[PDB]
């Protein structure tokens, strides 16, 4: 029991000393400003990759659409050939591709929503840094005023 009490006293004394020593508005703000921007950049990179991925997905989707069109030409060729099997294969392939496209579309919608959510979050995050930047300027302005005020009080 005694040890716990002793630890608390030491911790309390240390904590009181620590807060006063590290309480610099300008130093903390500068560090904070650098950190948020860095975090935002990482998010931006992820967003760019996601956008690229969506574009890549669209290209893949386009290829599937292109394949279906090519297959449609093959079906016409099959009629000239007169072979039942070629026509049957094209129809089966066309059906799975449509199903795949639907799945891809659902994935694309989810991806778009995620990107939109990320973009919305980014805008909110961007606004916060702007507010912080404005606040930092205001905070800095106040500090200059305080220095001026103290001298006036002194004289």
């Amino acid at each position: 029991m005694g040890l716990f009490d002793r630890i608390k006293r030491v911790v309390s004394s240390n904590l009181n000393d620590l807060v006063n020593k590290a309480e610099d508005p300008e130093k903390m703000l500068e560090q904070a400003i650098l950190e948020m921007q860095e975090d935002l950049v990482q998010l931006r990179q992820g967003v760019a990759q996601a956008i690229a991925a969506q574009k890549r997905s669209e290209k893949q989707y386009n290829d599937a659409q292109n394949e279906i069109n090519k297959w449609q030409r093959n079906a016409q060729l099959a009629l000239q050939k007169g072979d039942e099997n070629l026509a049957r294969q094209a129809l089966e392939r066309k059906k799975t591709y449509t199903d795949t496209s639907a799945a891809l579309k659902a994935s694309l919608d989810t991806q778009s929503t995620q990107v939109e959510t990320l973009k919305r979050n980014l805008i909110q995050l961007e606004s916060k840094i702007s507010e912080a930047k404005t606040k930092k300027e205001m905070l800095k302005a106040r500090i200059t005023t305080a220095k001026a005020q103290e001298q006036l009080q002194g004289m």
Binding site: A78, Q80, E84, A87, L91
Partner: peptide, 11 residues
């Protein structure tokens, strides 16, 4: 699928 194939055969 068989029904679809018949339409394809026409061409």
């Amino acid at each position: 699928d068989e029904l679809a194939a018949l339409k394809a055969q026409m061409l």
